[PDB]
Amino acid sequence: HGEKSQAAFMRMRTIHWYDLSWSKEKVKINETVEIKGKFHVFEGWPETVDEPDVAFLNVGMPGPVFIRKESYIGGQLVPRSVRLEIGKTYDFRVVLKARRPGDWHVHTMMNVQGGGPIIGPGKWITVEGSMSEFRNPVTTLTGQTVDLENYNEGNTYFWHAFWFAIGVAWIGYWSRRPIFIPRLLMVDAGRADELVSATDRKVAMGFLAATILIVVMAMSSANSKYPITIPLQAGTMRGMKPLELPAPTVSVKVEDATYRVPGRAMRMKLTITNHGNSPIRLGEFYTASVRFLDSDVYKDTTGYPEDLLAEDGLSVSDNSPLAPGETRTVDVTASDAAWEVYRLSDIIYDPDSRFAGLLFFFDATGNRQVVQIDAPLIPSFM
Amino acid sequence: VPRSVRLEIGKTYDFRVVLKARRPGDWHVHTMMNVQGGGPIIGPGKWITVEGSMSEFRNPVTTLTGQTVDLENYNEGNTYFWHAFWFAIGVAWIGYWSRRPIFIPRLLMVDAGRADELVSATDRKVAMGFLAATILIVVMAMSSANSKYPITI
Amino acid sequence: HGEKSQAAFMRMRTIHWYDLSWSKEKVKINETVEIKGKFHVFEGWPETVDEPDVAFLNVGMPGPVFIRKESYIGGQL
Amino acid sequence: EAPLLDKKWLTFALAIYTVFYLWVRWYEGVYGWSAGLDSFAPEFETYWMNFLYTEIVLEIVTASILWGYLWKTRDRNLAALTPREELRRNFTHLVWLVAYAWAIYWGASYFTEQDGTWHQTIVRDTDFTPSHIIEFYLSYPIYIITGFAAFIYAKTRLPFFAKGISLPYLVLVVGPFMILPNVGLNEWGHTFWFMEELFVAPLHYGFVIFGWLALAVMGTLTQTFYSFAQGGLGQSLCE
Amino acid sequence: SAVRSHAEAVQVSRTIDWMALFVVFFVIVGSYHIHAMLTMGDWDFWSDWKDRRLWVTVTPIVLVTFPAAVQSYLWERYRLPWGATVCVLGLLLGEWINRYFNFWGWTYFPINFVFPASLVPGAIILDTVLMLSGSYLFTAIVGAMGWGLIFYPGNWPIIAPLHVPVEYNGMLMSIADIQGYNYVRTGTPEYIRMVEKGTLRTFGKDVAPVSAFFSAFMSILIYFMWHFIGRWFSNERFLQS
Amino acid sequence: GWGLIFYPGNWPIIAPLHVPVEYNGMLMSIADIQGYNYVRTGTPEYIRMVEKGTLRTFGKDVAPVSAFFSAFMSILIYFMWHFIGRWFSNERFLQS
Ligand SMILES: CCCCCCC/C=C/CCCCCCCC(=O)OC[C@H](COP(=O)(O)OCCN)OC(=O)CCCCCCCCCCCCCCC
Ligand SMILES: CCCCCCC/C=C/CCCCCCCC(=O)OC[C@H](COP(=O)(O)OCCN)OC(=O)CCCCCCCCCCCCCCC
Ligand SMILES: CCCCCCC/C=C/CCCCCCCC(=O)OC[C@H](COP(=O)(O)OCCN)OC(=O)CCCCCCCCCCCCCCC
Ligand SMILES: CCCCCCC/C=C\CCCCCCCC(=O)OC[C@H](COP(=O)(O)OCCN)OC(=O)CCCCCCCCCCCCCCC
Ligand SMILES: CCCCCCC/C=C\CCCCCCCC(=O)OC[C@H](COP(=O)(O)OCCN)OC(=O)CCCCCCCCCCCCCCC
Ligand SMILES: CCCCCCC/C=C\CCCCCCCC(=O)OC[C@H](COP(=O)(O)OCCN)OC(=O)CCCCCCCCCCCCCCC
Ligand SMILES: CCCCCCC/C=C\CCCCCCCC(=O)OC[C@H](COP(=O)(O)OCCN)OC(=O)CCCCCCCCCCCCCCC
Ligand SMILES: CCCCCCC/C=C\CCCCCCCC(=O)OC[C@H](COP(=O)(O)OCCN)OC(=O)CCCCCCCCCCCCCCC
Ligand SMILES: CCCCCCC/C=C\CCCCCCCC(=O)OC[C@H](COP(=O)(O)OCCN)OC(=O)CCCCCCCCCCCCCCC
Ligand SMILES: CCCCCCC/C=C\CCCCCCCC(=O)OC[C@H](COP(=O)(O)OCCN)OC(=O)CCCCCCCCCCCCCCC
Ligand SMILES: CCCCCCC/C=C\CCCCCCCC(=O)OC[C@H](COP(=O)(O)OCCN)OC(=O)CCCCCCCCCCCCCCC
Ligand SMILES: CCCCCCC/C=C\CCCCCCCC(=O)OC[C@H](COP(=O)(O)OCCN)OC(=O)CCCCCCCCCCCCCCC
Ligand SMILES: CCCCCCC/C=C\CCCCCCCC(=O)OC[C@H](COP(=O)(O)OCCN)OC(=O)CCCCCCCCCCCCCCC
Ligand SMILES: [Cu+2]
Ligand SMILES: [Cu+2]
Ligand SMILES: [Cu+2]
Ligand SMILES: [Cu+2]
Ligand SMILES: [Cu+2]
């Protein structure tokens, strides 16, 4: 939730999430779900979004209904912010543990500093069980195993209640006497010195000394109880390993790209050159989490969110085997209610009417090439 | 490249610029790269002579709504009309109060404590009418502009 | 002097100085000493240190006990 | 010979706010998850936009009626006010101040940090989030209405406050009101200036500044005490 | 007369005392809570934001604001030395109510991950210094020094168990760090947390004391300014327009 | 009112200048084409402080949010400049 309201061109021109898998659709409490996939950083990064020099891989959900057990970018655990390069592709994996029952829309997201949220496709996952069964065991380097759900709760309650009680007692010591009107009149009359006695001064001195001594003793006792402590671990982790992918033996030029403004579709003229890899055929156009597929060339079998999957939303004028070398100019039409449901038609309000997306080409043997396209998008009103 | 672009250090780029003559005379024309946080980078300048009359210059542009306009005079009359209308409204508002003594007698009356005599019920009604008319005219003008141009970006 | 008090990871993760040579160990006044070597910039540069877009090669000593006659990075003064 | 302090009115002043805000919290819990997450959906419309429209209309009607009734029934001749009746009116104004303080706690403290929580657990999508609907457009107008009513009652019933416009009272009453227009800055702060959900960002310093104006209460309190004491209570108490 | 006897006057005064205490307490709760959260609430919400540099520095400086003004009013007009204590207690009450009923009751963030910082010792020090010395300059200097310095030692017994090192998936992590990692804050990524990350000019185990002393000095300055701010806020002026 | 009425008052003038045009394959505004064609040598394109879209920009709320923010800051600036002018209206005489 939160993507439909984001500018259409910003969603089109930031990060592209390609083949994704979810290990389970329905999980029990304390069971783990794995979300893996690839994300590509668009070369034409918008200028109002800072470069992903400081980026964090996040899980979009209405709260800690899951707990993120681990997250890996390129096989490396990433508990901190990371640095990503423009134009590179990265594998990502996220292992989550179920905490609260219910149906949850879970998304993979990249939070970018100086940019904001970049939400990926969301999937509905059902958690069955009771929240009381959730456990979060962690073993420390000191040899102690604790449960993070209730660890250190009683100590915090005790100390906060103790200090609150001390403050309440300090206020109530003075609250046993007339408070506001008689004291104000006495101060106005010049009898302020009569409002504080020697016993009050002794009580204040005792309160101050007891507070300081208790703080010192509590710090000493806490140090004795936990002689091994480390500061909070923070920093930006550089040197993320990107994917070394086969360059596309397929070249695609966008002649024109238009959308009818009333409109639930997008149309584009494309010149495609096959540089080998056998006769190929376009099977899918990915724009903003929406996948328009050509049923005759490719069929999704990964449980891609159906609200974002158009099984026959790709209409190519001529989708015949493009013999290696053939340069065919084709008119592709990406049509689906998701265009209007995911407010991609709101590119009419955007201060930049340019789109970007991914095209997937398959040969007879099923090998897939990914081609990256970007162009300006012209609205049609006649 | 109608917008600002990003260039890399140490790379070479082709550039092309097509210009249309507008005013007669001899003009020193240079190609330049304006760099943000740097300033102007002027290239070699060439003298070009333009012969003719400026009145013959036309700038036709065809919109996506099917209308062909000339950018030299497009929307000029509408801007003049609206600015003159609002200026006239302001002038009328000032001149309504300007028919009476302005500075010295009013200052003396305010100093004497007779300020409440300087504004009458008719003045209050006129001010209310001015405010209501201004708001209503603004709303109606916005609605009419939206109706005339339903497609804007 | 001044490195022992610097954070250990910052010292480990910034610049590595490898094979170094000193021309002389004992010098007279007005005599010259040459210090050559190689330095490698770590790929995982710490985020709290700005990238070495503006860097200066300096000599650490308690003052002008020496005068830096010249300094070359990659053969360039 | 009615009692000086009307316990029924004070009990009502506390209980109406308590019950209404408990019901509001229950509604937020029940419908904040099923309908409040997605803003471009029909259930979100019928469960939160209708709430916003109804609360705005009811706030306008209630503010108009209450302020007009308080200003219409003002004491034209306050010179004949007996000291006992003046003390009773002072107690009623103190009940009004109690109600204003309770509303201020409910608005500026509870729902503001609830809004902070909501923004830290989800991705912001619109300016009319259920948290924003409850906080900016329900609790803030409610405490503004209560403060305006308390100020009007003090000016129209207490001779101490009827001789002019009390500057500390005006600051304490109008200052927090400026928190409501400042919401626009907040929106302009989140949509354009700051790309991150940081609660300590300068775009929220407006709130902070106007919160400082609530400190004017101290000055107001002093005046209130004098309004309590000038009628002869102070002379008897000093004995 | 307004009252018929001295005992009736005493009872009426006690009732006014209770009602005015309610009013002052909850107006202070509202204003101080909104100021405190919108000035330093990101460090106060999460246990993995409670670092040695930014939290320790920032919190006392911004939280010394209201106690200074409330002391300047209460001690001067009523000789009531509990202004700082009442401000801290109201802020703590509001924060705890929100944490229990909203942070945990609504979004189910564990309480050990979302708890406020202890503030009573600093308020007690300030109040006792003001009461014993009776002068606002000495109170400012010494009490603000104590308020800044006692913040971190007072909170150490609470956060100490959360700093036990853990080898989490091959990386060294803190218990608070693991708490922040596991419990996902969708609107609060990791890069936002203003915590110390180490500098090439950071010296040998002096982060927390330096932060505490800087906080104490700025607390002196802010107390001095907010004393006069509250003095202005306590004016009994009437306008005619 | 002063903050809120600024943009509706100017909309009848600038509305004809926002008709979309397909200029050389790119979507442009009439005002954008005016800025492009008529060369400002001292005013490059990157200087214009105009909205370019943010990842936190929501569903068609730019102009109303800007108007309300302008109105609030107008309240503040009016309040301060009232006293500024009150000081500027002083009838004081100096002897040195
Ligand atoms: C006249 C009373 C004295 C005056 C002071 C007010 C005290 C009143 C407290 C009400 C207690 C009942 C709360 C349970 C609601 C009971 C209630 O409304 O329960 C339903 C919701 C849950 O609904 P849901 O979300 O659909 O459920 C799914 C997820 N839970 O829970 C709650 O609302 C409970 C949590 C919040 C309760 C508010 C806290 C209590 C208010 C204290 C005010 C501060 C007063 C300070 C005085 C020192
Ligand atoms: C919290 C921010 C503080 C605002 C500044 C303090 C008020 C101004 C003081 C100096 C000028 C007025 C005279 C003394 C005050 C009190 C005051 O305004 O008295 C009425 C006087 C007229 O009285 P007088 O017998 O003729 O002689 C002057 C009184 N000293 O009005 C004025 O002088 C002009 C209007 C007053 C200023 C507007 C109200 C201020 C309240 C805050 C407005 C809302 C902003 C905050 C929202 C977030
Ligand atoms: C527009 C900027 C405002 C400047 C500040 C206002 C002027 C100063 C006021 C307080 C001190 C003077 C007394 C009252 C004023 C008027 C003034 O200067 O009167 C003469 C007094 C001597 O008179 P007096 O009967 O002995 O008692 C004091 C009068 N209240 O001079 C002074 O007190 C010192 C010299 C005055 C200041 C210099 C002139 C200020 C004009 C602006 C200078 C140029 C800067 C702007 C250029 C861009
Ligand atoms: C949450 C836990 C709550 C803790 C409650 C602590 C109790 C607080 C205050 C007690 C007020 C008694 C005042 C009696 C003066 C009542 C008083 O003033 O009595 C006259 C005495 C006469 O004493 P004297 O013998 O003639 O002279 C002194 C040597 N003999 O004067 C005094 O000066 C007596 C001073 C006694 C002050 C005691 C207050 C100390 C309180 C510290 C509390 C520690 C906190 C708890 C630790 C875990
Ligand atoms: C650029 C275009 C310029 C527009 C010029 C507009 C004219 C402006 C002002 C006219 C001043 C007349 C004042 C008469 C009071 C002169 C006046 O006060 O006369 C006594 C009447 C008595 O009227 P009555 O019948 O006894 O009571 C009312 C119901 N019968 O009192 C009033 O209160 C009369 C109020 C009349 C005020 C008329 C002003 C409205 C002006 C709006 C102009 C709209 C703008 C143009 C639209 C395109
Ligand atoms: C059933 C619970 C207890 C009784 C309920 C009454 C309140 C509780 C205690 C005090 C009175 C007890 C006995 C009263 C008997 C009768 C009764 O209901 O009296 C209260 C008022 C009368 O107010 P009063 O004349 O000042 O005299 C009060 C002193 N007895 O009744 C009314 O009908 C209201 C008065 C008119 C003002 C209406 C306000 C505007 C209403 C519109 C909505 C406002 C905005 C809404 C929020 C946005
Ligand atoms: C009139 C109201 C003014 C504000 C006063 C109340 C405090 C409010 C905000 C600042 C508190 C710090 C926490 C950040 C929340 C306010 C906030 O959101 O700060 C963001 C920055 C970090 O992000 P950023 O990308 O840097 O953005 C800059 C926007 N300020 O925090 C920072 O604190 C860093 C910014 C620089 C300011 C440093 C803090 C001040 C240091 C002390 C000097 C000031 C004088 C102190 C008194 C002696
Ligand atoms: C004042 C009454 C006398 C009581 C003693 C006073 C405080 C304690 C010791 C005094 C000796 C000084 C050396 C400190 C022990 C020195 C000490 O214990 O330093 C610990 C760490 C150093 O850790 P490390 O390197 O692993 O240890 C090896 C050091 N070679 O430094 C710090 O904590 C830094 C000092 C704290 C920052 C404050 C500096 C003072 C700035 C001046 C303003 C504050 C003064 C207030 C003015 C009124
Ligand atoms: C300066 C005035 C002299 C009196 C105060 C003593 C000055 C020195 C230190 C106090 C500052 C707080 C502690 C941090 C220092 C600076 C300091 O010493 O920091 C190291 C550790 C913190 O290190 P870490 O990496 O977080 O690991 C935890 C290990 N404890 O704190 C300490 O060792 C605490 C030192 C002293 C604690 C007692 C505080 C009591 C004194 C302050 C109140 C004074 C008010 C007087 C009332 C009139
Ligand atoms: C962060 C820095 C510390 C904070 C600054 C305040 C500390 C102490 C003194 C400095 C300024 C306040 C002193 C009072 C003025 C000085 C003061 O107390 O009154 C001046 C007069 C009083 O009004 P009057 O009777 O009508 O005028 C005739 C003289 N009595 O104010 C005026 O004339 C109007 C201006 C008053 C504005 C003061 C407002 C105080 C600031 C509130 C804002 C929040 C705090 C911001 C700081 C973060
Ligand atoms: C006040 C008297 C009553 C008259 C009505 C008041 C104004 C109109 C409607 C009220 C209902 C609220 C919902 C708005 C319609 C709501 C509305 O029309 O929103 C349009 C766009 C949204 O465009 P979109 O997403 O394509 O549309 C689908 C929305 N799910 O939002 C906006 O324009 C944003 C709102 C403007 C910013 C102001 C917010 C308010 C901030 C508080 C301070 C200002 C208040 C002043 C305090 C005194
Ligand atoms: C807030 C106080 C209530 C009274 C005002 C109504 C509040 C709502 C909107 C008014 C702000 C200006 C319009 C932009 C909103 C925000 C808003 O609705 O913006 C959308 C469009 C602008 O969109 P765009 O992308 O530029 O495309 C042009 C399409 N029109 O404006 C509107 O739809 C205009 C809405 C209302 C216009 C009438 C203005 C009259 C009201 C303001 C004056 C009030 C003064 C009262 C005197 C006492
Ligand atoms: C952007 C924020 C809003 C602008 C700030 C101003 C708003 C209202 C009040 C705040 C300050 C002005 C109040 C007048 C002082 C307060 C004032 O009106 O007079 C103070 C005395 C008058 O001179 P005097 O008779 O000699 O002194 C004895 C007292 N009557 O000034 C002085 O003594 C000298 C200092 C006066 C300086 C005030 C200049 C006003 C500022 C002009 C600069 C331009 C505006 C900058 C803001 C952007
Ligand atoms: Cu979702
Ligand atoms: Cu891509
Ligand atoms: Cu050395
Ligand atoms: Cu190296
Ligand atoms: Cu905000």
Swiss-Prot record, chain C:
<comment type="subunit">
    <text>M.capsulatus has two forms of methane monooxygenase, a soluble (sMMO) and a membrane-bound (particulate) type (pMMO). The particulate type is a nonamer composed of three alpha:beta:gamma heterotrimeric protomers assembled into a cylindrical structure; the beta and gamma subunits comprise the bulk of the membrane-spanning regions and the soluble regions are derived primarily from alpha subunits which form two antiparallel beta-barrel-like structures each.</text>
</comment>
<protein>
    <recommendedName>
        <fullName>Particulate methane monooxygenase alpha subunit</fullName>
    </recommendedName>
</protein>
<comment type="function">
    <text>Methane monooxygenase is responsible for the initial oxygenation of methane to methanol in methanotrophs. At least in vitro, specific quinols can replace NADH as reductants.</text>
</comment>
<feature type="binding site">
    <location>
        <position position="40"/>
    </location>
    <ligand>
        <name>Cu cation 2</name>
    </ligand>
</feature>
<feature type="binding site">
    <location>
        <position position="1"/>
    </location>
    <ligand>
        <name>Cu cation 1</name>
    </ligand>
</feature>
<feature type="binding site">
    <location>
        <position position="16"/>
    </location>
    <ligand>
        <name>Cu cation 2</name>
    </ligand>
</feature>
UniProtKB/Swiss-Prot annotation, chain E:
<keyword id="KW-0503">Monooxygenase</keyword>
<dbReference type="GO" id="GO:0004497">
    <property type="term" value="F:monooxygenase activity"/>
</dbReference>
<comment type="subunit">
    <text>M.capsulatus has two forms of methane monooxygenase, a soluble (sMMO) and a membrane-bound (particulate) type (pMMO). The particulate type is a nonamer composed of three alpha:beta:gamma heterotrimeric protomers assembled into a cylindrical structure; the beta and gamma subunits comprise the bulk of the membrane-spanning regions and the soluble regions are derived primarily from alpha subunits which form two antiparallel beta-barrel-like structures each.</text>
</comment>
<feature type="transmembrane region" description="Helical">
    <location>
        <begin position="54"/>
        <end position="74"/>
    </location>
</feature>
<dbReference type="GO" id="GO:0016020">
    <property type="term" value="C:membrane"/>
</dbReference>
<keyword id="KW-1133">Transmembrane helix</keyword>
<feature type="transmembrane region" description="Helical">
    <location>
        <begin position="106"/>
        <end position="126"/>
    </location>
</feature>
<keyword id="KW-0812">Transmembrane</keyword>
<dbReference type="Pfam" id="PF02461">
    <property type="entry name" value="AMO"/>
</dbReference>
<comment type="function">
    <text>Non-catalytic subunit of the methane monooxygenase that is responsible for the initial oxygenation of methane to methanol in methanotrophs. At least in vitro, specific quinols can replace NADH as reductants.</text>
</comment>
<feature type="transmembrane region" description="Helical">
    <location>
        <begin position="81"/>
        <end position="101"/>
    </location>
</feature>
<feature type="transmembrane region" description="Helical">
    <location>
        <begin position="18"/>
        <end position="38"/>
    </location>
</feature>
<keyword id="KW-0472">Membrane</keyword>
<feature type="transmembrane region" description="Helical">
    <location>
        <begin position="210"/>
        <end position="230"/>
    </location>
</feature>
<protein>
    <recommendedName>
        <fullName>Particulate methane monooxygenase beta subunit</fullName>
        <ecNumber>1.14.18.3</ecNumber>
    </recommendedName>
</protein>
UniProtKB/Swiss-Prot annotation, chain F:
<protein>
    <recommendedName>
        <fullName>Particulate methane monooxygenase beta subunit</fullName>
    </recommendedName>
</protein>
<comment type="subunit">
    <text>M.capsulatus has two forms of methane monooxygenase, a soluble (sMMO) and a membrane-bound (particulate) type (pMMO). The particulate type is a nonamer composed of three alpha:beta:gamma heterotrimeric protomers assembled into a cylindrical structure; the beta and gamma subunits comprise the bulk of the membrane-spanning regions and the soluble regions are derived primarily from alpha subunits which form two antiparallel beta-barrel-like structures each.</text>
</comment>
<comment type="function">
    <text>Non-catalytic subunit of the methane monooxygenase that is responsible for the initial oxygenation of methane to methanol in methanotrophs. At least in vitro, specific quinols can replace NADH as reductants.</text>
</comment>
<feature type="transmembrane region" description="Helical">
    <location>
        <begin position="65"/>
        <end position="85"/>
    </location>
</feature>
<feature type="transmembrane region" description="Helical">
    <location>
        <begin position="1"/>
        <end position="15"/>
    </location>
</feature>
